[PDB]
Amino acid sequence: RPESELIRQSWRVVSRSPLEHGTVLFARLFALEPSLLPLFQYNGRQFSSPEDSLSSPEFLDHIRKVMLVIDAAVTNVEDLSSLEEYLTSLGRKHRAVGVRLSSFSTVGESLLYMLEKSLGPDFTPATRTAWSRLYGAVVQAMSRGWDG
Numbered sequence: 001r002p003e004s005e006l007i008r009q010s011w012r013v014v015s016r017s018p019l020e021h022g023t024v025l026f027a028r029l030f031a032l033e034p035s036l037l038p039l040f041q042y043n044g045r046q047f048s049s050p051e052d053s054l055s056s057p058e059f060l061d062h063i064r065k066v067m068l069v070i071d072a073a074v075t076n077v078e079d080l081s082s083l084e085e086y087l088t089s090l091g092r093k094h095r096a097v098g099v100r101l102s103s104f105s106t107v108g109e110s111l112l113y114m115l116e117k118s119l120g121p122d123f124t125p126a127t128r129t130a131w132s133r134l135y136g137a138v139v140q141a142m143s144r145g146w147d148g
């Protein structure tokens with residue numbers, strides 16, 4: 001597939017510096033949906049402001065975890081059915097921490113933002129479309145974790 005190749009090529013640029021790129025993704029996310037901030041409760045305390053989250057080692061580790069899951073999705077872009085069961089359980093976990101299924105579309109827009117910013121002129125409409133479809137497949141598998 002040509003879509004598969006657009007994904008693997010663009011991901012190559014981003015995955016050189018995953019924390020730097022993942023920081024962009026979460027900075028964008030909190031700018032779009034500030035009500036996601038209290039869902040990161042480490043030691044039972046809440047971040048007051050989005051900049052607080054950036055000095056938390058646990059929060060930075062969660063950015064690394066995110067980037068690892070995307071990496072696994074890119075690795076298996078040709079056959080995602082093998083990640084399906086892990087992704088369902090990952091959805092169930094996020095339901096438990098208080099994440100609403102609707103928030104995963106803001107996460108989707110934040111990922112596209114971070115790609116657009118990182119790739120500039122190389123972020124073509126074909127590339128955008130490919131990532132959108134892949135993210136779509138990932139969300140579908142995760143959404144099974146929300147009971148339905």
Ligand code: HEM
Nearest residue numbers: 036039040041058062065066069070093094097099103107
């Ligand atoms: C709506 C945005 C999200 C919020 C508020 C959020 C919050 C959390 C919290 C509070 C935990 C448990 C504490 C921790 O491990 O840091 C967690 C676990 C995790 N999250 Fe996220 N998360 C979000 C989105 C994502 C996305 C999009 C991915 C991957 C694509 C992801 C991957 C993970 C992984 C891999 C774990 C560890 C799961 C386990 O094995 O227990 N999260 N999430």
Ligand SMILES: [Xe]
Nearest residue numbers: 026027050053
């Ligand atoms: Xe952030």
Ligand SMILES: [Xe]
Nearest residue numbers: 027050051054
């Ligand atoms: Xe931020």
Ligand SMILES: [Xe]
Nearest residue numbers: 061062064065
């Ligand atoms: Xe971890």
Ligand SMILES: [Xe]
Nearest residue numbers: 018064067068
């Ligand atoms: Xe990572």
Ligand SMILES: [Xe]
Nearest residue numbers: 015018067071
């Ligand atoms: Xe990565």
Ligand SMILES: [Xe]
Nearest residue numbers: 066070107111
């Ligand atoms: Xe993501």
Ligand SMILES: [Xe]
Nearest residue numbers: 073134135138
């Ligand atoms: Xe993805």
